[PDB]
Amino acid sequence: DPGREGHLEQRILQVLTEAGSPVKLAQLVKECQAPKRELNQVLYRMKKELKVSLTSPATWCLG
Amino acid sequence: DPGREGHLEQRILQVLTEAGSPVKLAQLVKECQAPKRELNQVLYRMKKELKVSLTSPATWCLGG
DNA sequence: CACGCA
RNA sequence: UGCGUG
Ligand SMILES: [Mg+2]
Ligand SMILES: [Mg+2]
Ligand SMILES: [Mg+2]
Ligand SMILES: [Mg+2]
Ligand SMILES: [Mg+2]
Ligand SMILES: [Mg+2]
Structure with a gap:
């Protein structure tokens, strides 16, 4: 959606x-x-777009 | 089940x-x-029971 | 892409 | 328990 x-x-x-x-x-x-799976679908897409980065497991920062 | x-x-x-x-x-x-998920629920339980070993990613051998 | 996760 | 997996 x-x-x-x-x-x-x-x-x-x-x-x-x-x-x-x-x-x-x-x-x-x-x-x-939002359910964790729905957030993670978006986070890992933004990760491929280099908008956010994974600093450590399931921990996120601005790219 | x-x-x-x-x-x-x-x-x-x-x-x-x-x-x-x-x-x-x-x-x-x-x-x-059987679906991969239901096989994996049984395999990882059998691993805890020392009936099978995980010899490499998603690869299984008889015995602990 | 390994994933079993309740 | 990190899990995003189509
Ligand atoms: Mg709006
Ligand atoms: Mg029978
Ligand atoms: Mg991997
Ligand atoms: Mg369990
Ligand atoms: Mg782990
Ligand atoms: Mg995809």
Whole structure:
């Protein structure tokens, strides 16, 4: 669902931008009110686009 | 489902015993005619039980 | 692409 | 428990 996926990417970027430091998936699932698998589908697509990076397992930062 | 799981463990053991060597999961899925996920739930339980060993990624041998 | 994960 | 896997 692209409209949902767009909202998810929006929020991920907002939260990573406001954090200025690595953020765990556990926080992201709470911030996006979304199942972990749906967030991870978006995160790893953004990872291939070089928008976010994995600093450590299930921990994300702004690319 | 314990009846299904029992038969699946039976078939896994038959395949690994007859091979005399490590068997890939892809083989086991064809031999058992079961989805990969349900084979893996049984295989990793049998590994904890020391009935089979994981000799390399997704490759299985009889015995602990 | 290994993945079994409840 | 990292899991995204189509
Ligand atoms: Mg909107
Ligand atoms: Mg029977
Ligand atoms: Mg790998
Ligand atoms: Mg379990
Ligand atoms: Mg691990
Ligand atoms: Mg893909």
